[PDB]
């Protein structure tokens, strides 16, 4: 076979150990998930906007008493107007308070006032993968593989808890002080025991079944991993057009072309992730995540060493000191206006 006796036994024992780990991780998650206002706004000084989206913004803040820096996500309660927008914001807070994994950002406080919802998270000063990737062009295959391995382990963790992530992209991946990834932005994450139906995500990363208004499962995250690996290794994603409708037509076609510099092992992995047929997509078969972890492209990957953070990272961001923002782009700064009157009090009671 491909493995000799010793290798095959080591790999099986490894796989049993993964099961043991995930069983303990589920027990820990459920305790927190069943038992989910730990600060207030005037406890922080607002420093700089780190990113901006449709419903709000993430700001660097400094805690007045301790001087610790944090990233604060502010959502305008009124702007969270659409139905799926509301439920999504409750998913995000509940999931982030309950998970624990080395590549998932840590939530420290959450609170709300008359106008906004707030989630205060660890500040990760190395910046988004997005801007490093756009600046350099593309990552070499070993560099892309180091980041990909962390996403595979993170999805194996999330999916074992029946959580789907639903927004993988370089914009949502921060690089920490050791060069490892922190996944942020759980705004679309959801606990799903089987299928779900919301049309959501980012166009370039959507699996065909989402676009086609089919009920879908955690396999959409494995499709997205294929898009992410392609984009890291090529510098642009596989389904690339100026307008969302044209992107969707490319995704559903089931045609992908690869740069001539992609190795054959990488193309084979990507063909199996970017697979429109769900009965054939890696991560969705009898062997589950092991079809990915055991693929030839990952043959050099020490999965446990990645988890344990023992592997030397390809890139360490320059760090100028606590609260440095040099690795982030600039954004327009807007007032944090808090109304005299409570808005949407009933719709956010559980937050």
């Amino acid at each position: 076979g491909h493995m000799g006796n010793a290798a095959a036994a080591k790999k099986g024992s490894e796989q049993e150990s993964v099961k043991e780990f995930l069983a303990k991780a589920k027990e820990e998650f459920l305790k927190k998930w069943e038992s989910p206002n730990t600060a207030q706004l005037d406890h922080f000084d607002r420093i700089k906007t780190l990113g901006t989206g449709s419903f709000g913004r993430v700001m660097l803040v400094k805690h007045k008493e301790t001087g610790n820096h944090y990233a604060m996500k502010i959502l305008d309660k009124q702007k969270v107007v659409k139905l799926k927008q509301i439920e999504h914001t409750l998913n995000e807070k509940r999931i982030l308070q309950a998970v624990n994994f080395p590549f998932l950002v840590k939530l420290e406080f959450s609170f709300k006032d008359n106008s906004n919802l707030y989630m205060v998270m660890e500040y990760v000063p190395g910046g988004e993968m997005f801007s490093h990737l756009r600046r350099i062009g593309r990552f070499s295959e070993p560099h892309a593989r180091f980041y990909a391995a962390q996403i595979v382990l993170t999805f194996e963790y999330l999916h074992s808890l029946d959580l789907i992530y639903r927004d993988l992209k370089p914009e949502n991946l921060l690089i920490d002080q050791q060069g490892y990834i922190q996944v942020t932005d759980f705004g679309f994450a959801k606990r799903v025991k089987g299928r779900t139906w919301t049309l959501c995500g980012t166009p370039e990363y959507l699996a065909p079944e989402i676009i086609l208004s089919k009920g879908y499962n955690k396999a959409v995250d494995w499709w997205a991993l294929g898009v992410l690996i392609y984009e890291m290794a090529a510098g642009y994603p596989p389904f690339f057009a100026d307008q969302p409708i044209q992107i969707y037509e490319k995704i559903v076609s089931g045609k992908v072309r690869f740069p001539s510099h992609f190795s054959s092992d990488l193309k084979d992995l990507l063909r199996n992730l970017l697979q429109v047929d769900l009965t054939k997509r890696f991560g969705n078969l009898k062997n589950g995540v092991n079809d990915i972890k055991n693929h030839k492209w990952f043959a050099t990957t020490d999965w446990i060493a990645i988890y344990q953070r023992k592997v030397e990272a390809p890139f360490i961001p320059k760090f100028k000191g606590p609260g440095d923002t040099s690795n982030f782009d600039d954004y327009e700064e807007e007032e944090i206006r808090v109304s005299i009157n409570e808005k949407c009090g009933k719709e956010f009671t559980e937050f």
Binding site: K84, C200, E204, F240
Partner: peptide, 13 residues
């Protein structure tokens, strides 16, 4: 040709 800047998620589209 395709989108090179940051990409916004879609909530119900």
């Amino acid at each position: 040709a395709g989108r090179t800047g940051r990409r916004q998620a879609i909530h119900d589209i």
